[PDB]
Design an enzyme around this catalytic site. Sequence first.
Site, PDB file in Angstrom:
ATOM      1  N   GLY A   1      42.908  39.235  35.983  1.00 15.40           N
ATOM      2  CA  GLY A   1      42.251  39.774  37.167  1.00 15.40           C
ATOM      3  C   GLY A   1      41.128  38.885  37.665  1.00 15.40           C
TER       4      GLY A   1
ATOM      5  N   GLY B   1      37.678  38.855  40.408  1.00 17.85           N
ATOM      6  CA  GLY B   1      36.700  39.513  41.266  1.00 17.85           C
ATOM      7  C   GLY B   1      35.683  38.527  41.807  1.00 17.85           C
TER       8      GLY B   1
ATOM      9  CG  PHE C   1      32.855  40.175  38.350  1.00 21.42           C
ATOM     10  CD1 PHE C   1      33.681  40.980  39.131  1.00 21.42           C
ATOM     11  CD2 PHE C   1      33.282  39.837  37.069  1.00 21.42           C
ATOM     12  CE1 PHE C   1      34.921  41.415  38.649  1.00 21.42           C
ATOM     13  CE2 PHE C   1      34.526  40.265  36.593  1.00 21.42           C
ATOM     14  CZ  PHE C   1      35.333  41.058  37.382  1.00 21.42           C
TER      15      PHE C   1
ATOM     16  CB  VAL D   1      39.781  40.182  33.494  1.00 20.04           C
ATOM     17  CG1 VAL D   1      40.365  40.684  32.171  1.00 20.04           C
ATOM     18  CG2 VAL D   1      38.654  41.094  33.952  1.00 20.04           C
TER      19      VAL D   1
ATOM     20  CG  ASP E   1      38.049  51.772  40.594  1.00 17.05           C
ATOM     21  OD1 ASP E   1      38.505  52.490  41.525  1.00 17.05           O
ATOM     22  OD2 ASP E   1      38.449  50.608  40.370  1.00 17.05           O
TER      23      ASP E   1
ATOM     24  NE  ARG F   1      41.868  50.417  41.416  1.00 13.80           N
ATOM     25  CZ  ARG F   1      42.001  51.313  42.386  1.00 13.80           C
ATOM     26  NH1 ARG F   1      43.179  51.505  42.963  1.00 13.80           N
ATOM     27  NH2 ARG F   1      40.959  52.031  42.780  1.00 13.80           N
ATOM     28  CG  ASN F   2      40.429  50.424  36.647  1.00 18.90           C
ATOM     29  OD1 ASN F   2      40.392  49.239  36.291  1.00 18.90           O
ATOM     30  ND2 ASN F   2      39.786  50.839  37.718  1.00 18.90           N
TER      31      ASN F   2
ATOM     32  CG  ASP G   1      35.751  49.815  35.742  1.00 23.21           C
ATOM     33  OD1 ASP G   1      36.242  49.122  36.670  1.00 23.21           O
ATOM     34  OD2 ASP G   1      34.944  50.761  35.943  1.00 23.21           O
TER      35      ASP G   1
HETATM   36  O1  LIG Z   1      37.585  47.353  30.783  1.00 23.24           O
HETATM   37  C1  LIG Z   1      36.658  46.591  30.564  1.00 23.24           C
HETATM   38  N1  LIG Z   1      35.366  47.019  30.552  1.00 23.24           N
HETATM   39  C2  LIG Z   1      34.909  48.332  30.839  1.00 23.24           C
HETATM   40  C3  LIG Z   1      33.753  48.460  31.624  1.00 23.24           C
HETATM   41  C4  LIG Z   1      33.209  49.712  31.947  1.00 23.24           C
HETATM   42  C5  LIG Z   1      33.856  50.865  31.492  1.00 23.24           C
HETATM   43  C6  LIG Z   1      35.015  50.766  30.698  1.00 23.24           C
HETATM   44  C7  LIG Z   1      35.762  52.008  30.234  1.00 23.24           C
HETATM   45  F1  LIG Z   1      36.739  52.266  31.125  1.00 23.24           F
HETATM   46  F2  LIG Z   1      36.321  51.783  29.032  1.00 23.24           F
HETATM   47  F3  LIG Z   1      34.993  53.117  30.179  1.00 23.24           F
HETATM   48  C8  LIG Z   1      35.546  49.501  30.375  1.00 23.24           C
HETATM   49  C9  LIG Z   1      36.981  45.130  30.262  1.00 23.24           C
HETATM   50  C10 LIG Z   1      35.988  44.365  29.611  1.00 23.24           C
HETATM   51  C11 LIG Z   1      36.180  43.008  29.314  1.00 23.24           C
HETATM   52  C12 LIG Z   1      37.389  42.390  29.668  1.00 23.24           C
HETATM   53  C13 LIG Z   1      38.384  43.124  30.327  1.00 23.24           C
HETATM   54  C14 LIG Z   1      38.203  44.493  30.652  1.00 23.24           C
HETATM   55  N2  LIG Z   1      39.202  45.190  31.284  1.00 23.24           N
HETATM   56  C15 LIG Z   1      40.523  44.662  31.653  1.00 23.24           C
HETATM   57  C16 LIG Z   1      41.522  44.509  30.484  1.00 23.24           C
HETATM   58  C17 LIG Z   1      42.740  43.822  30.709  1.00 23.24           C
HETATM   59  C18 LIG Z   1      43.661  43.687  29.653  1.00 23.24           C
HETATM   60  N3  LIG Z   1      43.372  44.216  28.428  1.00 23.24           N
HETATM   61  C19 LIG Z   1      42.211  44.887  28.173  1.00 23.24           C
HETATM   62  C20 LIG Z   1      41.268  45.050  29.199  1.00 23.24           C
END
Ligand SMILES: O=C(Nc1cccc(C(F)(F)F)c1)c1ccccc1NCc1ccncc1
Length: 274
Positions: free
Chosen positions: A21, A23, A25, A28, A152, A156-157, A170
């Site tokens: 992904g 963004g 910022f 990923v 969000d 997709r999340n 996220d």
């Molecule tokens: O999701 C991330 N951070 C996150 C932030 C806030 C809330 C939450 C929640 F949703 F968990 F509360 C989770 C995240 C952090 C680091 C890298 C990838 C990330 N996501 C994509 C991903 C893709 C493939 N495999 C695993 C993850």
Amino acid sequence: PYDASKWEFPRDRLKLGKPLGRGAFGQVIEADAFGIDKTATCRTVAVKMLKEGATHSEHRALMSELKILIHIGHHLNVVNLLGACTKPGGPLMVIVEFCKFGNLSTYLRSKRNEFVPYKVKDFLTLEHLICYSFQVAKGMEFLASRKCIHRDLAARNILLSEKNVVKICDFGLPLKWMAPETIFDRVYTIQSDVWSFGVLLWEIFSLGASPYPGVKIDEEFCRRLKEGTRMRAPDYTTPEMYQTMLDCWHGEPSQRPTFSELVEHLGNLLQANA
Ligand SMILES: O=C(Nc1cccc(C(F)(F)F)c1)c1ccccc1NCc1ccncc1
């Protein structure tokens, strides 16, 4: 405060790879972390990192996310934090467990030709769809218990791992998933995430379809939402499941069910489907 002894990981013990992904910022990316599990093994991880030209506001945002993830802790239906690269010498990195099969929306769309309501092979059933819904509700109930709001909540999340296990994540405007009080008053609560969960239920029981089909997203769409207009039942829903969506889409946030109520409700529907 940040616990370094527990979460700091060396940048040299990380091998960056394929992007997942992108963004404003940063991005990923998929990577291999050597000895992240207090051992000498190799684990595939998802890394959120800042671009070279980064805003101080962007660095604060990624640091906040790291703090939010440390606070959340471990749960089977929430992506698990494994480490971070915060010390100087390179960019800010946030390391989580990798989800190989990607987002639920993309996965369900690829399984439309592979659906039967029940088995009396590599096929989805109603039990699968209710199970995914149940798992998301459990992860959201856990986030609520940690006093966290997603902001969000969409298919997709929702990521898919091995053994039909779904995990809330996220990657980061998303008007289709937004509650009326979030659009009109900018109020973000756990009850506005319940509304989003309802839209996510619609995404699951439509097998990855886009919410509000052919509907123009503007001021009229918003006025109709406030007026009580709702999405029609998706193609793969049960009557009870569509009512659960309608309960999540109650105009009054206090009249919507809680994630704890949804865990119990979805848990019983899973039994009733057998
Ligand atoms: O999701 C991330 N951070 C996150 C932030 C806030 C809330 C939450 C929640 F949703 F968990 F509360 C989770 C995240 C952090 C680091 C890298 C990838 C990330 N996501 C994509 C991903 C893709 C493939 N495999 C695993 C993850």
